[PDB]
Design a protein around this ligand. Sequence first.
Ligand SMILES: O=P(O)(O)O[C@H]1[C@H](OP(=O)(O)O)[C@@H](OP(=O)(O)O)[C@H](OP(=O)(O)O)[C@@H](OP(=O)(O)O)[C@H]1OP(=O)(O)O
Ligand SMILES: CCCC[C@H](C(=O)O)c1c[nH]c2ccccc12
Lengths: 567, 76
Amino acid sequence: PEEVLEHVFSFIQLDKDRNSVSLVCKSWYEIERWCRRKVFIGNCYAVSPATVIRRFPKVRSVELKGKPHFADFNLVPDGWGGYVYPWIEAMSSSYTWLEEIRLKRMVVTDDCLELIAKSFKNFKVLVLSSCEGFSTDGLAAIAATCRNLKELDLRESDVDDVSGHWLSHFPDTYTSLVSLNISCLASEVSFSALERLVTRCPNLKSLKLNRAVPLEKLATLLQRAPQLEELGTGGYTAEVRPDVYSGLSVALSGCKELRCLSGFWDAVPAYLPAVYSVCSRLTTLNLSYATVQSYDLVKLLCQCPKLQRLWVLDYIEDAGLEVLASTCKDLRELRVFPSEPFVMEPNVALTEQGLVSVSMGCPKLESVLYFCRQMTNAALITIARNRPNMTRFRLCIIEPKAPDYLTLEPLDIGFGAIVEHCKDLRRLSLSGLLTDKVFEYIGTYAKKMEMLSVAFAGDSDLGMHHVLSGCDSLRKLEIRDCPFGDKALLANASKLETMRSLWMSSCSVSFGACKLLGQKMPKLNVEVIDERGAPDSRPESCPVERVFIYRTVAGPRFDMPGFVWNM
Amino acid sequence: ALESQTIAILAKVIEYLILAANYLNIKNLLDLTCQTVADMIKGKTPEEIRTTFNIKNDFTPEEEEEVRRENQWAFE
Ligand SMILES: O=P(O)(O)O[C@H]1[C@H](OP(=O)(O)O)[C@@H](OP(=O)(O)O)[C@H](OP(=O)(O)O)[C@@H](OP(=O)(O)O)[C@H]1OP(=O)(O)O
Ligand SMILES: CCCC[C@H](C(=O)O)c1c[nH]c2ccccc12
């Protein structure tokens, strides 16, 4: 009975649950749209501003993702798309009460930022995860205008460096900042502006600095920010001096609420110890940019018993992870990045025994990203054996098509065990020497798997076909340099419709099959992204460079650059 | 005790269905019941729900499908 329904509905905040209510009857469809607070739009071309604005009119929070994931590997050329302007314009006049905009991998310009700033009075949360196309003039515009701002989170964005002067446009009456993340900025912000800023903002819980803030100034900021829950240091290097060390040590330990640490660029082993007051209550540690050798890392990790997330270079090494394994019983997620990929010549001693160790040791480990240079099915089988609760596993063997190094064999059984034994594996990245067999594996067992990424693997379309055929939960599949082509793709065209997207580049998908697929399937945009010009000026049997395929309810897009073609 | 600015069947109202908590204006209890009802739903299909109430569908597949498409393709 309406009022009551409104209120019951407010308790439901899950997109899948929201959707689910909207389909019970016309009447629930109706109440529900009207009191929908946020929309998640994982593919910005899947639907149109106007469609969204007109269904869900009282929206306070919008999330948009642009380019697909393989943009992070440089495999989507510029101009491709991602433009958010149309969204701001549309929402600008329609969404007065709009508070948050989280964009991922979109093009965002100074003009957008301006328009956000101008149209949105209650505007509180701007996250720009991996965006590009604005400069600090844009951020100035936000600083100056958004009286109520709470988050300015620029994680990974590519900014134009005009000047670190944008930050000082926050007016002296501004206090409401909760989270500031400027790690991608190279522009040196004004230290006094910042410091003054940190001080009048009593609710600021997350501060992530850029490299330009030097170690020596860290302590000062922290004295102003004693209630911080997350800190990302700036530069973490300096002349060794016990004044400096000590000022650090105290300020750091006056932050009793600190749980996450990152930053550490150029970090000096002499100054990490400063951070040991925090270590014992720390849940997230991100040591990705520290090039500190293993023992140092070990000394830091020994005293991190409550640690849930660790990202670290492979400098940690096997011994490293052996420690981690006895030390952090609560560890949920581990990411080991490479320190030196473009050498095939082991500069660290990080092997598979590392991950193997962690997997007996951490009852709760369930997300992995691991870069090593060698692997075996026995490792993988053991890992799968040990970690049935695993839910994301991304292995990345550096030298491609590398076989198991003891038996010289494919890694198919290795990975088979992962997918067999890890019934909630919701995500997966593969590497090493792999035959169509792994795919039969994936297809038979990976039933909950949502996301698969594959490179230099498989034998024939039969690989891709097992995957489109068996993987019931698939949402995103992305393939590069495999011998998958037309057969697999057309035998399974209707699957594409149950999936947010598929991406294939440097594969064997002919221009011919692209056209056919377009025709069979009006409602997919089947996009050829190719850089040698008109496709119809090559024999239709010729492989396209890249094709990107996604369902949409909006038909072909209006912003294709010159090297993109909708079939 | 005294609350519903609707003020200002007896059932458990005093020893503290929604209808009408609602009523009579007992803010807090509305929240007590509405949150637990909401649970009745979290993680249930649209059929599963309309079963466990007494809303019979009035969606003719034309529309029932077109919504499910928008929902999934664009909002999930
Ligand atoms: O949910 P999606 O629409 O598939 O977005 C996913 C997803 O984000 P959420 O899980 O937070 O919703 C991944 O989360 P996990 O797989 O890590 O649990 C995230 O992974 P990471 O942020 O941890 O890397 C991943 O990021 P990415 O694709 O850059 O690896 C991102 O993918 P999208 O680019 O498709 O959003
Ligand atoms: C810098 C992050 C790289 C990890 C990436 C992934 O986990 O998606 C990955 C890992 N192994 C892969 C094989 C094919 C395509 C993508 C991957």
